[PDB]
């Protein structure tokens, strides 16, 4: 479906 | 942000968008509800191609001349475009980011204006994962506040059933119906735009033309709106000049090539008949005949009927013919629908009404079962017509329907169009109807207990009165009771029965010339009043058939013909010779 | 398929809704009329204004797959009628139109690929060949008004029995060669 992900970035 | 937003006075400018004729009531209720103070959201509902799209880029247009009051001076309309503004927006704030730096803008300016084109889709524009954040809940506060001024544009059928279920962003907007314009003010559109039209296609259009698009598309092309109907058949014919080849050239587009347009959109005959399908006409009748032997008042009556259609003397509301043919057997009632649809070179719509007995199988029709959630709805009558417009549409066995099969047919022969239950409209202005029955054969054949023989072949017409309602035989257009056939006319449907043979024979190499007196034995010994000239084949089949069956399987028949079919004055009875 | 083609260039030539839909019943020749319009390309069989003209073939299948995103969908979608806006004489060939009318992408929404097109087909920047079925035509297409406006219906009749053998002629050479068999001219009839 529409789903919103949230990334992480490299310490 | 300038990717999402596309000003269309800048498209002014440079001619993108065409220019907006009359509509001055539509468009004067628009400056003043953006004028409000509070709400100034104008909303343009209406069907499809009615102007919606046209007086927003319309009132731009305006603006870049001065043809508009001096406080919508100095105001640009942005029109914004959803999908770029969803487009990789995967990360969670993304769209919101998007969403209200457009709206950032529109605050700080104070004389901007937003134009939303098909406004039924920021309801759910951002929700993710059922989520209620939307265009539509973040839009609210500045549309109640009376920051920013947003124009809409949606069908009645969107707005109604996914605009106005929000009825929160609905009291936001103000409606403003527009209704379709007449036919005077529609030509004095196209006026407007015949000059962006006529460049395009480096052609003219004669006013005459003009006036006769709008009044043939309005006769003949329905399920559209007149603006875009007329517009469709210019736009149309313009095309057809500009290709066609150098030669014979013609820059000018004359009334007839806008009727050549209207006939293969609605897929009819074409008005102010060729020389080509007169010939048609001429020898329509004479062609039946050949094929048909007696009855000669049934052909009459569909070659007359069809002539007036063809030569602008229809009725303009009702279907080409309507004619219950009501005869005996074997007399020929259905074979000349038959012929008619080979001599016409149109589709054939054959209905047997022997299964509509019952009222759950006549809702088939006009609609699909009570439950059928299969996409294939739709009625099998209004379906078939609507594939073929111009078409013979045979009802076989009337009577036996069920009556209620009569109050479907009443609309037919009256207003020429049948609803299916989707709300889609049949037009029935060039169908051919007829319908066969048997109602009276045996009423006038029936003997009479009295010394006197009664006055028998009325009670025919009476019986048909009980069996059809007053109204269905009201408008009909001729009730034609065939005649039984005579023994001059079963002579000729022994030659037609032979060429048939022939044919097949023919296929298989063979070749058959029957003597004339065989032939009047043949016609002498199947001739029956009663069962018309079905009986004439089974003496074909037994007499010819029956032998030749046995030697084409096997013996001198498997190729090469030469049969010789005669007959024996002492013995009464036909003699076949092959010599392979 | 000449009169049905000449239809076609002509809605394809008009200013405003160049989208010509070839509706038909099933194998009468829906997308070989669209494909055929490319072969003809190529050899030169077709007007001027014709010529110089690349036919797209979208696949709704592989576009819609691989999005699990909000926003892939658009944005590939998007990007496609960039391609075709800034190229004239590029045109899209959707076969099975009718699935674009229901939500390709959108779940409880109506950001859908024919309300994406409908502003570009509108103002004629670009051109679709579209094609599908008389029952899908009736009960899928024609529920949105607004789209069916955009398309101009070509009816597609099924040929005759002269015409078909033409058609068989045709198309032999294509049949021997993977077949290895020659195939008799009786035998087509
Ligand atoms: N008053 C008018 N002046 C000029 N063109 C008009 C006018 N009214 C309608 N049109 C034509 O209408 C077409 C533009 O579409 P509209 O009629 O605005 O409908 P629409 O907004 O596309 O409708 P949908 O698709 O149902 S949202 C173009 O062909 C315009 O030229
Ligand atoms: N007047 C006629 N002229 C030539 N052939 C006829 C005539 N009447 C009947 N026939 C033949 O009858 C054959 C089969 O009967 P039909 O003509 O279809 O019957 P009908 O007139 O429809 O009456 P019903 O339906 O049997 S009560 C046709 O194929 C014709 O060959
Ligand atoms: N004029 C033609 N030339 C070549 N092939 C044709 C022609 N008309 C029909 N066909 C054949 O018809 C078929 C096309 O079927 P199609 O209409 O795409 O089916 P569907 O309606 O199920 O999608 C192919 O086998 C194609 O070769
Ligand atoms: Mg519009
Ligand atoms: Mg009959
Ligand atoms: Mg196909």
């Given at each position: 479906?529409?789903?919103?992900?949230?990334?992480?970035?490299?310490? | 942000?300038?990717?999402?937003?596309?000003?269309?006075?800048?498209?002014?400018?440079?001619?993108?968008?065409?220019?907006?004729?009359?509509?001055?009531?539509?468009?004067?209720?628009?400056?003043?509800?953006?004028?409000?103070?509070?709400?100034?959201?104008?909303?343009?509902?209406?069907?499809?191609?009615?102007?919606?799209?046209?007086?927003?880029?319309?009132?731009?247009?305006?603006?870049?001349?001065?043809?508009?009051?001096?406080?919508?001076?100095?105001?640009?309309?942005?029109?914004?475009?959803?999908?770029?503004?969803?487009?990789?927006?995967?990360?969670?704030?993304?769209?919101?980011?998007?969403?209200?730096?457009?709206?950032?803008?529109?605050?700080?300016?104070?004389?901007?204006?937003?134009?939303?084109?098909?406004?039924?889709?920021?309801?759910?524009?951002?929700?993710?994962?059922?989520?209620?954040?939307?265009?539509?809940?973040?839009?609210?506060?500045?549309?109640?506040?009376?920051?920013?001024?947003?124009?809409?544009?949606?069908?009645?059928?969107?707005?109604?059933?996914?605009?106005?279920?929000?009825?929160?962003?609905?009291?936001?907007?103000?409606?403003?119906?527009?209704?379709?314009?007449?036919?005077?003010?529609?030509?004095?559109?196209?006026?407007?735009?015949?000059?962006?039209?006529?460049?395009?296609?480096?052609?003219?259009?004669?006013?005459?033309?003009?006036?006769?698009?709008?009044?043939?598309?309005?006769?003949?092309?329905?399920?559209?709106?007149?603006?875009?109907?007329?517009?469709?058949?210019?736009?149309?014919?313009?095309?057809?000049?500009?290709?066609?080849?150098?030669?014979?050239?013609?820059?000018?587009?004359?009334?007839?090539?806008?009727?050549?347009?209207?006939?293969?959109?609605?897929?009819?005959?074409?008005?102010?008949?060729?020389?080509?399908?007169?010939?048609?006409?001429?020898?329509?009748?004479?062609?039946?005949?050949?094929?048909?032997?007696?009855?000669?008042?049934?052909?009459?009556?569909?070659?007359?009927?069809?002539?007036?259609?063809?030569?602008?003397?229809?009725?303009?509301?009702?279907?080409?013919?309507?004619?219950?043919?009501?005869?005996?057997?074997?007399?020929?009632?259905?074979?000349?629908?038959?012929?008619?649809?080979?001599?016409?070179?149109?589709?054939?719509?054959?209905?047997?009404?022997?299964?509509?007995?019952?009222?759950?199988?006549?809702?088939?029709?006009?609609?699909?079962?009570?439950?059928?959630?299969?996409?294939?709805?739709?009625?099998?009558?209004?379906?078939?017509?609507?594939?073929?417009?111009?078409?013979?549409?045979?009802?076989?066995?009337?009577?036996?329907?069920?009556?209620?099969?009569?109050?479907?047919?009443?609309?037919?022969?009256?207003?020429?169009?049948?609803?299916?239950?989707?709300?889609?409209?049949?037009?029935?202005?060039?169908?051919?109807?007829?319908?066969?029955?048997?109602?009276?054969?045996?009423?006038?054949?029936?003997?009479?207990?009295?010394?006197?023989?009664?006055?028998?072949?009325?009670?025919?017409?009476?019986?048909?009165?009980?069996?059809?309602?007053?109204?269905?035989?009201?408008?009909?257009?001729?009730?034609?009771?065939?005649?039984?056939?005579?023994?001059?006319?079963?002579?000729?449907?022994v030659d037609?029965?032979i060429?048939?043979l022939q044919?097949?024979?023919?296929?298989?190499?063979?070749?058959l010339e029957v003597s004339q007196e065989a032939r009047?034995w043949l016609?002498?010994?199947?001739?029956?009043?009663?069962?018309?000239?079905?009986?004439?084949?089974?003496?074909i089949?037994?007499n010819l058939?029956?032998?030749?069956?046995?030697?084409?399987?096997?013996?001198?028949?498997?190729?090469?013909?030469?049969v010789t079919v005669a007959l024996?004055?002492?013995?009464?009875?036909l003699?076949?010779?092959?010599?392979?």
């Open positions: 479906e529409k789903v919103r992900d949230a990334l992480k970035p490299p310490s | 942000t300038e990717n999402f937003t596309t000003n269309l006075n800048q498209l002014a400018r440079v001619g993108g968008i065409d220019p907006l004729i009359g509509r001055e009531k539509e468009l004067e209720r628009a400056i003043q509800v953006l004028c409000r103070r509070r709400k100034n959201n104008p909303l343009l509902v209406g069907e499809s191609g009615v102007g919606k799209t046209a007086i927003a880029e319309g009132l731009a247009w305006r603006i870049v001349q001065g043809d508009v009051p001096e406080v919508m001076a100095d105001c640009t309309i942005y029109s914004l475009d959803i999908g770029s503004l969803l487009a990789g927006t995967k990360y969670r704030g993304d769209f919101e980011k998007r969403f209200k730096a457009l709206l950032k803008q529109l605050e700080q300016d104070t004389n901007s204006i937003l134009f939303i084109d098909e406004i039924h889709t920021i309801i759910g524009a951002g929700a993710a994962s059922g989520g209620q954040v939307d265009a539509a809940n973040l839009i609210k506060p500045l549309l109640s506040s009376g920051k920013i001024r947003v124009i809409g544009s949606t069908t009645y059928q969107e707005f109604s059933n996914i605009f106005e279920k929000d009825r929160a962003l609905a009291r936001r907007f103000q409606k403003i119906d527009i209704t379709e314009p007449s036919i005077e003010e529609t030509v004095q559109i196209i006026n407007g735009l015949k000059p962006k039209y006529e460049a395009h296609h480096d052609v003219r259009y004669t006013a005459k033309a003009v006036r006769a698009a709008v009044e043939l598309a309005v006769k003949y092309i329905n399920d559209r709106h007149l603006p875009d109907k007329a517009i469709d058949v210019i736009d149309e014919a313009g095309a057809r000049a500009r290709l066609m080849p150098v030669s014979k050239r013609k820059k000018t587009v004359n009334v007839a090539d806008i009727e050549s347009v209207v006939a293969r959109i609605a897929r009819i005959p074409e008005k102010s008949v060729s020389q080509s399908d007169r010939d048609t006409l001429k020898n329509l009748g004479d062609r039946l005949k050949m094929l048909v032997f007696g009855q000669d008042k049934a052909i009459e009556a569909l070659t007359e009927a069809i002539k007036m259609a063809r030569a602008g003397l229809g009725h303009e509301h009702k279907p080409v013919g309507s004619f219950l043919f009501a005869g005996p057997t074997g007399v020929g009632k259905t074979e000349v629908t038959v012929q008619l649809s080979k001599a016409l070179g149109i589709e054939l719509l054959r209905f047997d009404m022997s299964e509509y007995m019952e009222r759950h199988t006549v809702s088939r029709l006009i609609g699909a079962p009570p439950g059928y959630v299969g996409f294939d709805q739709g009625g099998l009558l209004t379906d078939a017509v609507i594939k073929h417009p111009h078409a013979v549409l045979l009802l076989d066995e009337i009577e036996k329907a069920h009556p209620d099969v009569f109050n479907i047919l009443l609309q037919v022969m009256d207003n020429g169009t049948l609803t299916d239950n989707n709300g889609r409209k049949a037009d029935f202005r060039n169908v051919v109807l007829v319908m066969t029955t048997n109602a009276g054969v045996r009423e006038t054949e029936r003997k009479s207990i009295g010394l006197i023989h009664q006055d028998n072949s009325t009670d025919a017409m009476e019986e048909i009165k009980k069996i059809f309602t007053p109204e269905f035989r009201n408008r009909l257009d001729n009730i034609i009771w065939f005649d039984h056939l005579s023994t001059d006319v079963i002579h000729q449907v037609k029965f060429v048939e044919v097949q024979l023919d296929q298989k190499g063979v070749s009047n016609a002498e010994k199947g001739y029956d009043r009663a069962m018309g000239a079905r009986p004439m084949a089974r003496v089949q037994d058939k029956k032998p030749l069956a046995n030697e084409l399987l096997f013996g001198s028949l498997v190729d090469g013909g030469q024996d004055k002492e013995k009464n009875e003699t076949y010779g092959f010599q392979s």
